Amino acid sequence: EVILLEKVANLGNLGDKVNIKGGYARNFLLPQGKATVATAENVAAFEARRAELEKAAAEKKAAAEARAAQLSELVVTL
RNA sequence: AUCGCUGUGAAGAUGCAGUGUAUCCGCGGCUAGACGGAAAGACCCCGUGAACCUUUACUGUAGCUUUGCACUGGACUUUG
Ligand SMILES: [Mg+2]
Ligand SMILES: [Mg+2]
Ligand SMILES: [Mg+2]
Numbered sequence: 324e325v326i327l328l329e330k331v332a333n334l335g336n337l338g339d340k341v342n343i344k345g346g347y348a349r350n351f352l353l354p355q356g357k358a359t360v361a362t363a364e365n366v367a368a369f370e371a372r373r374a375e376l377e378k379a380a381a382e383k384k385a386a387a388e389a390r391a392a393q394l395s396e397l398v399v400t401l
Numbered sequence: 402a403u404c405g406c407u408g409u410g411a412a413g414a415u416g417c418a419g420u421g422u423a424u425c426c427g428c429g430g431c432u433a434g435a436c437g438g439a440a441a442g443a444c445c446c447c448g449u450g451a452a453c454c455u456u457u458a459c460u461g462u463a464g465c466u467u468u469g470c471a472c473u474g475g476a477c478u479u480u481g
Contacts, residue, residue, distance in 0.1 A: 333476075346473045 324348060325358040326369070330380065
């Protein structure tokens, strides 16, 4: 149904069309901005931003390298 | 123009039949009768009458409750 935008799911893809439940798309993916409903209205806009999709995937996974080095420090004092 | 008796009679007679009694008209009393007056009997039966109650009469329903399909998702699992 929808066109995916994230790859940190457990059965997600890059841009493959998936047939998911109506409750899982209405409630969770779309109101956060992780998917987009496929339709034949603005198809000229998604094909032009395909070069911008590969640059957005090299930033979310690159920020995790400078993030996990401060979470496992175990310096929290209760 | 409103007496008694004994019989008759839609079967308990002031009015019929037979026979005895009795001048015309008040007032004060008493209630035996006029199946006295009041109330289309309430008892009793009837009407393919009417109500309100009862239950284990019949047909249903409020309410309560079981399970499908919606709202409604992922992650692993046992099993057909
Ligand atoms: Mg007589
Ligand atoms: Mg008379
Ligand atoms: Mg009567």
